[PDB]
Amino acid sequence: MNFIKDNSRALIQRMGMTVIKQITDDLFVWNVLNREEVNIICCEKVEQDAARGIIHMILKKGSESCNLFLKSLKEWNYPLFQDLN
Amino acid sequence: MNFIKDNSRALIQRMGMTVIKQITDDLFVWNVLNREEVNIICCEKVEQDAARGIIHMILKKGSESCNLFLKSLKEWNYPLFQDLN
Amino acid sequence: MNFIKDNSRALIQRMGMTVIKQITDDLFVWNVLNREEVNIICCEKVEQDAARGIIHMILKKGSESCNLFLKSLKEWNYPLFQDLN
């Protein structure tokens, strides 16, 4: 995805932990991330580090699986994604 | 395996450490890698280096033992293997 | 132990940190693990990594000392060990 890579500087900044545990919920229900790739993200204390944990697991997982993150970002935390565009 | 060799440039890139410790779990349970060939992989810090550690232990171990890696890659980290095809 | 090795793929998955700090309690009281081999396990953040930390310290410690783990798994977290069989 070109969108996630170009906005990755702000998506590791303004994202926030309270939506990261909600986005990685929908990424697990849709069988993208397994349980142990959630525990890599959600166990890190700083919200910027868990934001680095998702995005580098998105960009390795194809381009069609980048969408299911971005569909989960337009549902949870829409005012970021409205301002991100 | 022709599949692992041709995709080895991307499989050392998009694989990720969180699944490498999960794939080398199933490779140990199925008696492919012993314990000391897991410690060569999982002790390396960069996730790209542990990805070079598995694949060069796969390609030396036959062709029928390449499958048990690839069966473990369609279970753990399927959105890579879906996008890898 | 043949039982721990064959189920090691699921025992690093469904085990959970809340019982790992309870199993390695009973492994320390029964003088299997010393204190520094508990700190290797319990300091790791992901619950799958501490689960890899116990099991690879069990399989190196004999076969009769594998039982004291498995006796501690039928006391703490029995619904796993009921479903594991």
Added chain:
Amino acid sequence: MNFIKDNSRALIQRMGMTVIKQITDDLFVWNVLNREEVNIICCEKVEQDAARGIIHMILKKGSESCNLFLKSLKEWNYPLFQDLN
């Protein structure tokens, strides 16, 4: 359980703390969760985090032990489970 996994996005959202301390009561009386796996759940402040604490302790504990959660969800908080179906 396929039911808990597919509805896990909504079950960490609409569940609520007042029933989570009541469901983990029945999970303790039926010897699924011990006391220390209740203290992992009930000590977390946000009701969404304790909801993530139960469900990831259910999915690791077999499939037959997923039912005793779901029997406790049709007794306590039935209007969720009526609307969940």
Added chain:
Amino acid sequence: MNFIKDNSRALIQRMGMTVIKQITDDLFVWNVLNREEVNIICCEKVEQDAARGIIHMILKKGSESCNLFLKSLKEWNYPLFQDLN
């Protein structure tokens, strides 16, 4: 201390947070634990984790300093220590 080590499985279970903040009070007044070794114990949320925090700071601090814990356990929470013997 042989007594604390042998009962450490139950002392991290039945102890309880409400006495752990009272025992580590008397351990601070008697100059065993400083303030920062109380903050390691009392900031942990689960009462079993703060119980692991005291006991592993007792067993490292000599054998004569194990007594001042045990004198503080026969004053605060005597019905445990009565049933512990």
Added chain:
Amino acid sequence: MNFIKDNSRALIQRMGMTVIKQITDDLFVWNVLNREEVNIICCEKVEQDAARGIIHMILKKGSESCNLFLKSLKEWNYPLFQDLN
């Protein structure tokens, strides 16, 4: 700063978390620490560890930026800074 370095043993001891989240407020408003260097400090549980987190981010940030910490310590928690001198 010679003042912060010489008193750093007591400033990681008597500082306290309730003022550390107030000092790192004024350090963020004055554009010294960004948001992610606050999350390194304030997410640590022990108040001595967050006190080690500020001071080692002060001493790396110049000498003129050490003052804005010390101006924020004479406003918030003056009875320490009165007794520190």
Added chain:
Amino acid sequence: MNFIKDNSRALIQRMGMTVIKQITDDLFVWNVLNREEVNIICCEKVEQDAARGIIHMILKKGSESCNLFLKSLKEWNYPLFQDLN
């Protein structure tokens, strides 16, 4: 760059890990460092070692690509770069 080389003794000292993971974010978005040259930096535990990891990847990458580091150092951690001049 003459500026980075002459200040490299202090830039491996006062830089700090919390900005190094933020600078190497902007170095990746601007296509200077790929992902595996971030994992060489950010996986090292000491903040001085990750600071040696960036700067020796800057000085090998041209002189015009030294600027994009220095533009990212005047945005993230400006009080260093103000005091560095």
Added chain:
Amino acid sequence: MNFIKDNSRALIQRMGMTVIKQITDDLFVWNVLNREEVNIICCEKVEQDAARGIIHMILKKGSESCNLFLKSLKEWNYPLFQDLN
């Protein structure tokens, strides 16, 4: 120092991380360890490994600089040093 070397087996065992970050505070204020030799110690996860990190930096730093460690061990964690003698 003959005292630190002979008790180094127990000083890497019973020391504990909560005092190691307090001893290496006083070792930095007294200009023995610089900042990067603290980051070698305090970034290691196991408390036994950070205890190996101090003592092997003491025994290389003279004999008169071994005292300032031992003066900092009779202030912080005296019940060890009382029982160590």
Added chain:
Amino acid sequence: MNFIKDNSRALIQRMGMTVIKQITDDLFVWNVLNREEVNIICCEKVEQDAARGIIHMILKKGSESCNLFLKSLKEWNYPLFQDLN
């Protein structure tokens, strides 16, 4: 190749190990280097020595096979190759 030979003084200097293990990945997938000619390169500790290991295996392998190195250098580590021209 005239380009690799003339810039070989800087290509053994500014190249870096983190891209050398990535370039020799693409050189192996495209059947230029076999596995044992990668192990000559990647096992050498200094990044300048592995850079001498690739280039002297390029210049012996034809001129049309020099391109596949240079195509792999415009993909991995482009800011060198941008500044190299």
Added chain:
Amino acid sequence: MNFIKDNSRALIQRMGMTVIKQITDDLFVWNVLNREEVNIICCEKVEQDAARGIIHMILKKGSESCNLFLKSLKEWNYPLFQDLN
């Protein structure tokens, strides 16, 4: 020693790094290994390689100095040495 040589295949397998840094502690306190012969062992990443590092420094150091290893193996990691016999 006939015991160490005959069991050297399993002692480089089931030993584990967490006890190797504890055995080479007691080997240093008893003046068998100096500091630089510990750094040969403990700096190697794989736990099997540090296990090869001790044993080949034992078998070169006499037969009476093989005992002090074996006394340190019956104290630290007794369930191996119980199962080793």
Added chain:
Amino acid sequence: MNFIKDNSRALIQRMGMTVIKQITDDLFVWNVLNREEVNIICCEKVEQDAARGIIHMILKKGSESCNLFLKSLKEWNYPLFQDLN
């Protein structure tokens, strides 16, 4: 041995260093290779060179001593020896 000689082209290719240090362990315990004939093998950096080091020490050592290598290859690295046949 006719088997080792005919497969020596692949046994210096697919063998791997992680099993070569494990095979030459069992060759030393069974008194085939002494210590200095292990140091000829295991000190070579490329895994293909240590594989040339074993096999040319096997073929000089009789035919009955070729078996103890091949018994150690059916225990360590069986998926090669399964695919080798």
Added chain:
Amino acid sequence: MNFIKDNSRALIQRMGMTVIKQITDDLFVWNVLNREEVNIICCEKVEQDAARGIIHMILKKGSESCNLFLKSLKEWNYPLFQDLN
């Protein structure tokens, strides 16, 4: 062979040691070179000298035995032999 003789100026130049130890592997398995005619080649330090060692042992060994070298050069180091034609 007319092909080896005419290209012998470049085959002692661009060949490389890493393939010379691989070609003389296949020349030994096919019973062309014995072991002592490999030790004449592979013990020479410069890769150009071992390249002079093979080719002058090829041209003395018939013309039909020149092919088995050239079949081993189209398998190992094909990009030379592609560019050699």
Added chain:
Amino acid sequence: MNFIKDNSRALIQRMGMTVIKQITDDLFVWNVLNREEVNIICCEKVEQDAARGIIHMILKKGSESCNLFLKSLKEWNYPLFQDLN
């Protein structure tokens, strides 16, 4: 330098890696060691070997360039250099 040569037995012993990467920082900023003579030092695993790597690059580089090492040893690791005199 007579001072470095006479104390070279202790300077390869008590120096330590954490200051060797800091001394060779200042030796690079002052244009004594280039980058590839740092990679010879800092890539060696044992701290005694990197200490042998600096000192034998000092004694070959003049006598006036021995001072810039010794000025960097009185800034970084002064308690050694205080005890060295």
Added chain:
Amino acid sequence: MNFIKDNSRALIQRMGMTVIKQITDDLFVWNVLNREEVNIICCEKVEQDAARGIIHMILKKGSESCNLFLKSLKEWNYPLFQDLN
């Protein structure tokens, strides 16, 4: 050259291998030494022997080609050449 001949006793002593592989890089780029006259130098293990290998290939190659060595010695390893004068 009179300068190289008179200082050849010290230039085979204080030169060092890490610059010899860097000087013979620039001697190859400037078409003085071909590849096989580098392999005579750089394959020798002792750094004094490779230093004898360059200088006796300089003094045979004219006097105007002695300069390109000496220009490469004032760029790489200037503190020798500063102290050599």
Added chain:
Amino acid sequence: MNFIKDNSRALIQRMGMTVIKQITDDLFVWNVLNREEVNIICCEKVEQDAARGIIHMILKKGSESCNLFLKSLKEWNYPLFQDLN
């Protein structure tokens, strides 16, 4: 020396590289071996070969200079020299 010659079979066996680089340190500080006679010893890969390198440089260097080796062997690696007698 009669002692070194008679024990030279075991001193090239049980000595070990980690003390050989420490003994040849003290042999250089005491002006026995120059730098180039250390590089003959320490550059050899097998620890038995560097042990042959010292002893044959001792026996050529007088009998009074054999002592300074043996004084350096009773300081570094005393448990050999205790068992050697």
Added chain:
Amino acid sequence: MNFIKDNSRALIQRMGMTVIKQITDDLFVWNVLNREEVNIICCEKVEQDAARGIIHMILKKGSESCNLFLKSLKEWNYPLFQDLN
């Protein structure tokens, strides 16, 4: 000796350099070969040539001095001498 002469065709073939430097160690300690008759053997590069160097120095040195070779061949490299009989 009739045994060495009749097996001299295989003893110059299967012997190997790693034991030849170990046999000529024991031949020197027992005052058979002096130092200069070791340097004739061990300086030859091919292991078959050093094997021709020992045996033709054995057969000239009596018959009772042939035994001390053969006693040193039943200690070092016994699996040859077991298969030689």
